[model samples]
Target: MDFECQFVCELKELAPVPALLIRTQTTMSELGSLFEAGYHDILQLLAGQGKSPSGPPFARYFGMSAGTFEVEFGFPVEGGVEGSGRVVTGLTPSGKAASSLYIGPYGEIEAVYDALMKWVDDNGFDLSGEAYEIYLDNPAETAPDQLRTRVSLMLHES
Candidate 1:
């Protein structure tokens, strides 16, 4: 599988977004099952709270100390919403980041990350903040080869 897309790296200012999220601690093998259930639950809770999504769902990694990918499956919203159980309010960090819209299969995303991180390093920046892959297209409804994921590496001056 090809790793790099025809992606252009650029500095973009991210807005402070209000969101609802489901944080999960799971292995890669279990990610699909957990995400499927929690994804629907969070969305339903959002609708019940009168806040609609402003962008595609995202997974924010907290850390993986013991091979478990601690992640938060987030739904960005136009504004704030109250939490329901596992659903909680959080802020999408607002600042500079090296970003690129990666286009292709999800499996190729690691290459995208490598390229972006290299770009950041070569360009005199350090990846010191939150990093996220925002789904720009519905992978379930869109062709796998055409899915778009916005890859952003938060940056700090080196």
Candidate 2:
């Protein structure tokens, strides 16, 4: 698949937020319930009519007050849930490279990533940097099957 969009740049930090994530070393299937529960919990918290802080601040609220629950199927890393966070800064391609649309559950997101990676390799393009998954539509309000997301992979001139 191919995606066309104006070239854009962004910088973001991947900070650790209170997230209920289940890591699966053997199979990604083990993460289904974890993802569902975490997302549901977040939605419930944000249900009321009010303004919430954006970015890390919003995440921090969950961590500090609501508390973040994470289930790691693998061994523990140096940073607990919060420590695993990171900061990301980068640019997006303006012209077309490769892109796809995914719906019906976030569990299927891995498939999209795999397909994009394969496309890049097949096209003889070298992966340049970290990729991003943008939530085009909020799953909190929409049905899981109706949720929309745009996953972008950065590539460099080869």
Candidate 3:
């Protein structure tokens, strides 16, 4: 698993993206199912309004506590969407961020995180706000080894 060439971490300037999402407090065991259900629900909500995702689907993590993850999962939208039930309007973090493009099994995504964290620390940057992952390709149609994801964390401003 030579992730040395498979992923690269960098600092990027990002713009806030409007999104519609469902938030949940979930454990690692239930995280998979939560993502599945949450994505389904958000798609249904978009379809009902005759709207389509403006960008790749993403999962934002506010924080974790005692194995419980505070997660908000959904699709980026073109703005001006109304909340339905558990779905609500949200914004992806903006400004400078530490990011990496990961290509491999989701189970091995920790490597990307490891690289990003080191990049942040070595570059003299502190993490700010939430962390998130943008799914760049559909897993159902792509091989696990070929899956692509963009993982990012906002950086604190000096």
Candidate 4:
């Protein structure tokens, strides 16, 4: 299905955010399952700690090597929650970032990434830090065609 809503790329200034995450290395083929497992672990940890997610789930990319992705999958959390075991407390990327709200299946996300990257380049900005794919709509409850993701990348300072 085609997108019913138009997506736009924009710039945003973000403050450092507290999060609970599980960092791991996974191949592209295993990324989906990894998100599920990592998210599950994070949720379980949050439940145990009596804390709730402050925002939608997100996966931060630290870069890739040998076809393996270095990813931290987790949900934003309120301050002062000390994660346990494999789930550790971390901070989301902050500072100036190029962002886009994309509504579509994960399979179609490359277009958004391409568009956002192009927008940054065309606007004379270069990628400076980590990237994030924030899942706004739950795939289990939302239609695949209607899934929403916020794609963001940190930009270099002038």
Candidate 5:
């Protein structure tokens, strides 16, 4: 599914996101599965810890290697909680960032990222920290072209 790109990559102020996250690394081919498993882990942690996700699931990318990328996947929580053995606690990237809304299929989402990369470089701002995606809607319930995702990248300190 494709559409005329109507990008809204704007520089804005972002607040801290308290979440329960699990970290992992995978190649582009397995990124989808990595996220699936990570979310499963987080769900179990939530049930055991007597906690519930306050927001939609999100993924935080640390960096990508040769055909591989390191990422953390989880859902936003209200506050700190005791991590279940291995599952850990974290806060999404905070402070100034470039955020964009992409409404399309997964494969098409990259075009928005490319636009953001250019927007950042063309407008003059360095990538400060890991980039993360905030899932605004559930993928299973959402239509192919109606999926809404908000991508936020922290500004690198210069």
Candidate 6:
């Protein structure tokens, strides 16, 4: 079950930026905690301050400071958070095949990754690299129901 999605291909600046970057070296649980914390902090900051304070709090969790980050989007996956999902993006030294999906919220993003991996498998595509999700629109600015997310995947010939 594959679907079409709209995606924005761009380079992200990560220099002297205050953001949360979490590297998932162990388990999802560890990553989840950092993600949840960073996400909550960003949300609170957005709610009260009304704008992205500085760098995203989650960027720190990823251990990424100043590099181009990629993001993708797809349909909402079940058994996931109400307003959360994955956002995929492509990286530099480009020419990597990229795909994206639009999802409802940011919580059910893991499901989106499952779908992406399935897509790669079914399509004879090999994930010879790491994929990433980027939060596009600010949750504070849009209604949860109307929120849009983009998830991008980098592909290579198997």
Q: Which candidate has the top score in TM-score? A: 3
* Model 1 poorest 10 in a row by lDDT: 1-10
Which regions of candidate 1 are displaced past 4 Å?
1-7, 62-66
CA displacement after TM-score superposition, residue 125 of candidate 2 (Å): 1.0
Window of ten residues with lowest summed lDDT in model 5:
1-10
Q: Per-residue alpha-carbon lDDT of model 3 for 1-158, expressed as tens digits? A: 53442346778898888889887789888988888888988999998898988988988776653488788888889877776999999887678878888988888987777777777777789987678789989787899989999988878877
- Evaluated against the true structure, the overall lDDT of model 5 is 0.77
Q: For each candidate, what TM-score against the reference?
A: 0.86, 0.40, 0.89, 0.89, 0.85, 0.42
The digit string of per-residue lDDT tens for model 2 on 45-148 reads 33322323132111100111123432231111122222122211112223333455566666667677677776667666665544544455556677997977
Clash pairs, candidate 1, are: none
Positional deviation of residue 97's Cα in model 6 after best superposition, in angstroms: 3.6
lDDT per residue as tens, model 1, 32-77: 7887788788888988977778778887654532478677787887
Candidate 1, residue 75: Cα displacement in angstroms equals: 0.8
Error of 6 at 70 (Å): 13
Candidate 6 residue 26 Cα shift, in angstroms, is 11
Off by over 4 Å in 5: 1-7
Measured by TM-score, how close is model 6 to the native structure?
Answer: 0.42
- Model 1: residue 157 alpha-carbon error in angstroms: 6.6
Candidates ranked, most accurate by TM-score first:
3, 4, 1, 5, 6, 2
Better of 2 and 6 by lDDT: 6
lDDT (C-alpha) at residue 44 in model 6: 50
Give the Cα lDDT of each candidate. Answer: 0.77, 0.40, 0.82, 0.82, 0.77, 0.41
